[PDB]
Design a protein around this ligand. Structure first.
Ligand SMILES: *[C@@H]1O[C@H](CO)[C@@H](O[C@@H]2O[C@H](CO)[C@@H](O[C@@H]3O[C@H](CO)[C@@H](O)[C@H](O)[C@@H]3O)[C@H](O)[C@H]2NC(C)=O)[C@H](O)[C@H]1NC(C)=O
Ligand SMILES: CC(C)NC[C@@H](O)COc1ccc(CC(N)=O)cc1
Ligand SMILES: *[C@@H]1O[C@H](CO)[C@@H](O)[C@H](O)[C@H]1NC(C)=O
Ligand SMILES: [Fe+3]
Ligand SMILES: [Zn+2]
Ligand SMILES: [Zn+2]
Length: 341
């Protein structure tokens, strides 16, 4: 009965979640929805207890009263001593990526180009880039900036969805879940890698994990780090090893959210679950690995070492940071006291 109902987004996260449930002796059970927003609603209704969310969704969930519980903690070895779970999270680097061979393409020449986004409302693939575009362009017409784009979650008949491919059967075009071929970090990077788009708004870690043999996936096997360039905000182009000096912003780590009244219980269960299926987990990579899904980032990002405790008992605004929270407000004025359901 001290069971947590996780919310899976899409049928792939659903399959993984059921695997995790089977392996957990049903201490973790699953609910599934077609979109992250839908999953947030199941949580709000009390039909689900939690899910891991990108910062852009943390904001949406936050206005509706959901709270940050644990955050993804990546592999970084500085802040050396502390165990991952107590280690402060460092946020990730949102970057704008292009093909090297696409010479001359700079932040300054993006208008009317083809773009690849993780999804609408996500931090690196949308809020940061479009916030900057809107900032600099003076206009709220961010649907008219790129000639065509794949921005999962936008209107399927609009140009913002024109580049999306849907699933293997061409169905679910532009849906904001993994069925969409160009969804999320990897999908958006694939959109760029296959030259469907001119630029991809992902994070620094995405380019590395999908190049120089790190993938084995058909589309990425032959990808070489040198064939890509990051677009700095000053107009220059740098190699992807220069992310620390050429990025659009550092994003708050994806984090697990739940209803305030269920947070403590979710925190508790989760810590026990990762001890079992986490990075050094008791049953991983033997029975089941929570943070692994063949580089598809299902439920959690695949580069997650562990889920770490937060700190000054973070409200959702403190977790995202004032800088980021203001940015989203300024961007969504284009579409404070809110929620949306
Ligand atoms: C797009 O819209 C505006 C363009 O200026 C940006 O919003 C502004 O962001 C600044 C920087 O974070 C905010 O300044 C802050 O002010 C408080 C006190 O007012 C201060 O304590 C902080 O240290 C900081 O200086 C400013 O409030 C905010 N402007 C408005 C009208 O809300 C926004 O960041 C731009 N979007 C992106 C993604 O850059
Ligand atoms: C307003 C007062 C001072 N509270 C600040 C507070 O609760 C801040 O929250 C946080 C959240 C997350 C992080 C990142 C980190 N490295 O721990 C740092 C600080
Ligand atoms: C389920 O959770 C309980 C409560 O903490 C724990 O004692 C038990 O080991 C877990 N069962 C399985 C099969 O993991
Ligand atoms: Fe993200
Ligand atoms: Zn920076
Ligand atoms: Zn606080």
């Amino acid at each position: 009965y001290t069971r947590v109902v996780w919310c899976a987004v899409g049928p792939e996260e659903q399959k993984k979640c059921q695997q995790w449930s089977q392996q957990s002796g049903q201490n973790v059970t699953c609910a599934t929805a077609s979109t992250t927003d839908d999953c947030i609603v199941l949580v709000l209704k009390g039909e689900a207890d939690a899910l891991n969310l990108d910062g852009g969704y943390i904001y949406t969930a936050g206005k509706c009263g959901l709270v940050p519980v644990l955050a993804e903690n990546r592999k970084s070895s500085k802040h050396s001593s502390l165990d991952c779970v107590l280690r402060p999270t460092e946020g990730y680097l949102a970057v704008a990526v292009v093909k090297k061979a696409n010479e001359g393409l700079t932040w300054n020449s993006l208008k009317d180009k083809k773009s690849c986004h993780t999804a609408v409302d996500r931090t690196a693939g949308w809020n940061i880039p479009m916030g900057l575009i809107v900032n600099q362009t003076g206009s709220c017409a961010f649907d008219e900036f790129f000639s065509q784009s794949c921005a999962p979650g936008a209107d399927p008949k609009s140009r913002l969805c024109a580049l999306c491919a849907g699933d293997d059967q061409g169905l679910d075009k532009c849906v904001p879940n993994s069925k969409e071929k160009y969804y999320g970090y990897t999908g958006a990077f694939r959109c760029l890698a296959e030259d469907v788009g001119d630029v991809a708004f992902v994070k620094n870690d995405t380019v590395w994990e999908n190049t120089n043999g790190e993938s084995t996936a058909d589309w990425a096997k032959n990808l070489k780090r040198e064939d890509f360039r990051l677009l700095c905000l000053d107009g220059t182009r740098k190699p992807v090893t220069e992310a620390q000096s050429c990025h659009l912003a550092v994003a708050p780590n994806h984090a697990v959210v739940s209803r305030s009244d269920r947070a403590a219980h979710v925190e508790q269960v989760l810590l026990h679950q990762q001890a079992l299926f986490g990075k050094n987990g008791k049953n991983c990579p033997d029975k089941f690995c929570l943070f692994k899904s063949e580089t598809k980032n299902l439920l959690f990002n695949d580069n997650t070492e562990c889920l770490a405790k937060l700190g000054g008992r973070p409200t959702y605004e403190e977790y995202l940071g004032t800088e980021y929270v203001t940015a989203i407000a300024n961007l969504k004025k284009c579409s404070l006291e809110a929620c949306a359901f």
